[PDB]
Amino acid sequence: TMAGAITDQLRRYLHGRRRAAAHMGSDYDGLIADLEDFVLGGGKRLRPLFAYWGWHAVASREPDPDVLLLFSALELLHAWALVHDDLIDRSATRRGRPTAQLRYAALHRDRDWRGSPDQFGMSAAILLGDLAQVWADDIVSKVCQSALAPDAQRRVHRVWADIRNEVLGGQYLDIVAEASAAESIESAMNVATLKTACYTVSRPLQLGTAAAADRSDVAAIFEHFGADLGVAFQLRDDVLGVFGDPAVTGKPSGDDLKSGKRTVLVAEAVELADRSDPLAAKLLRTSIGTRLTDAQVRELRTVIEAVGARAAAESRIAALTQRALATLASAPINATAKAGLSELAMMAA
Amino acid sequence: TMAGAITDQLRRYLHGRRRAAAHMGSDYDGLIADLEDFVLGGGKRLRPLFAYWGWHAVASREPDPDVLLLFSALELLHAWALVHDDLIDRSATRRGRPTAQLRYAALHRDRDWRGSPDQFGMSAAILLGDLAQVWADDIVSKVCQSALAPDAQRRVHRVWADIRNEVLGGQYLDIVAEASAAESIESAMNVATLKTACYTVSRPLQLGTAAAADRSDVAAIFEHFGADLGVAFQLRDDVLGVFGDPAVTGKPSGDDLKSGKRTVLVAEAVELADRSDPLAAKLLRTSIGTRLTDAQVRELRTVIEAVGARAAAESRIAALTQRALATLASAPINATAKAGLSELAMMAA
Ligand SMILES: [Mg+2]
């Protein structure tokens, strides 16, 4: 499959960088090995696949192996995003396994090392995320020099600068929204647009289009396609974060309410409750982002259901997915890319 | 001066990126403004100046303004290193001014925001350092495509990949050495070579040489030059970190011992004490990295001086600086670069 060919390019790149850095000792080599296990650990490779279909949409032939490596840089970049995300969220586990700060703090305590184990774990986690960022970037620099004409080089860099600027802005806007208790739907839609629409769908699509051809028409359509599908992805995640199966999602029931996320679903519930039951709106406003018992959480989830927020989210997802498919159907791109992107928009739900 | 022209290129670059990111709101704009304030806050511009003399050594003409912007990328990269360093060290101030995590925790309290102000400060500081890194790299990508021939592009990327790989390895090796109580002079020499020799002198020099010409002979000589002068810089800092006047250094008296650093000075003191005062060696071994009173610190400083570690460090600094100037005198480079590098090696030492 295409995800495996993209992943194999990344495995060979990481293996080469690791070997070339072996003179720095076995401790740094162990950190690189940790990065290999996290990045290559397995997944759908959603963002590199969006880059492929963006290339397929405006290209005739298949990309060179080095261009597949360019698409894989989005996977290495995502490791940077997730590792620093786990520090910002103070998450203990990811996919059932301990986060980086916990793995290195436990290593500190197993070795009977001195100083604070938790300080070492956070410091090592910062550096682990930093390494993924500089190496994901080094891929783009290396592939641009070796496999791309200078015009494709300039188009690729401008997408690469935007996607890293937008995911950093999205991260900061999110912690500001949670700290300031931003209630509005517009605030949550802004974060979802930067974090999910731009970072996961639109900009990956434009990376493959930029590497293939000078098609500003298609890049603008993919931005409109990603703005609808990306928000649909976020709302699905928000619904699952409140009402989903914990054994499936990996997070407890009502986790978003537990953690105090400022989702569109939450913002929509406060707005609907303002019109239907002001006392339910006051319950939501004073409970979100606080330490909630299991009973308080079940009550908040039911109130979100009672005022129609979940039903409103489901129709949002249906409408956005339908328009995104309509934008895809009438796009001046190869029909084979229209099939794979409708496939991917469904395989990724 | 040359530092001002380099700084002006960075200020104009940062102003452009800030304006182009204005659509992301006033909160993210305040983070970028804080980045401008920190990077442009003032300094020697030591690392961009090393890059200039590396260019001057093998070039005929002066660099174009865009190449000065390439040299300024080292200053933006240094903000990434310092911001994340302040998090790794849990430092509260830097040169008398609060660190990033403290500035953003104060913003959180000023706004009466929700959650932990210190957790917000650490998260914002992580993102701030991440932003400096991606924008420092966006400079290198932008200048390479627009102002450099493809061969110079490839030489510049190789140095850019090495300097960020080596400062990350030096950071991890340092926290591992402190946590594992690495006593050897070799371990401290390895960290000082990566953190100071490579990162501050050698690689910046090679960045300017790479941007100017294909001179493998000069790049290898600057590596030998930086390996001596860079360690001499660190040994001077280590002596000042233990014996320096707080009015001159700006740091407390005996700060390195208070902070528990694994310096060559401390490593050499343990080795010298093993020969002359074995019980003083045990006092050093069991006190470095612990909570020390002001009397314990004064006691350790006197022991370090008594066993001759301070005098050994002074002769190391003298020998390394003398050999570095001898390597500079016999280098196949322009004599004007030989003068500026001897002057630059003096203004810093
Ligand atoms: Mg680049």
Residue numbers in the entry:
A (entry chain A), B (entry chain B): 0 to 348
Question: What did the paper state?
Answer:
We report structures of the Mycobacterium tuberculosis isoprenyl diphosphate synthase Rv2173 in three forms: apo and two substrate-bound forms [isoprenyl diphosphate (IPP) and dimethylallyl diphosphate (DMAPP)]. The protein possesses a canonical all-α-helical trans-isoprenyl diphosphate synthase fold that is dimeric in each form. Two divalent-metal-binding aspartic acid-rich DDxxD motifs termed the FARM and SARM (first and second aspartic acid-rich DDxxD motifs) are important in all-E-prenyltransferase mechanisms. Rv2173 is a homodimer with a canonical class I diterpene synthase fold, with structural analysis identifying some conserved mechanistic features in C-terminal closure and supporting its annotation as a short-chain (C10–C15) product-length synthase.
The apo structure was solved with a dimer in the asymmetric unit in space group P21212, while both substrate-bound structures were solved in space group I222 with monomers in the asymmetric unit, generating dimers on the application of crystallographic symmetry. Consistent with most E-prenyltransferases, which exist as homodimers or heterodimers, Rv2173 is a dimer in the crystal structure, with this biological assembly supported by native mass spectrometry. All three structures are very similar (0.36–0.65 Å r.m.s.d. across all Cα atoms as calculated by SSM; Krissinel & Henrick, 2004), with the main variation being in the completeness of the C-terminus; the apo structure is missing the last four residues and the DMAPP-bound structure the last eight residues, while the IPP-bound structure has a complete C-terminus. It is these C-terminal residues in conjunction with the aforementioned lid helices that are likely to close the active site fully during the reaction cycle. There are some differences between the structures: the IPP-bound form shows IPP bound in the DMAPP/allylic substrate-binding site with three divalent metal ions bound around the IPP and the complete C-terminus closing around the active site, while the apo and DMAPP-bound forms are more open, with some of the C-terminal region disordered, supporting suggestions that the C-terminus is important in substrate entry/product exit. In no case is the IPP binding site occupied by IPP. Additionally, in all structures, and even in this most closed form, the basic residue Lys43, which is likely to be important for the binding of the PP group in the IPP site, is poorly ordered and this disorder may also influence variability in positioning of the metal ions.
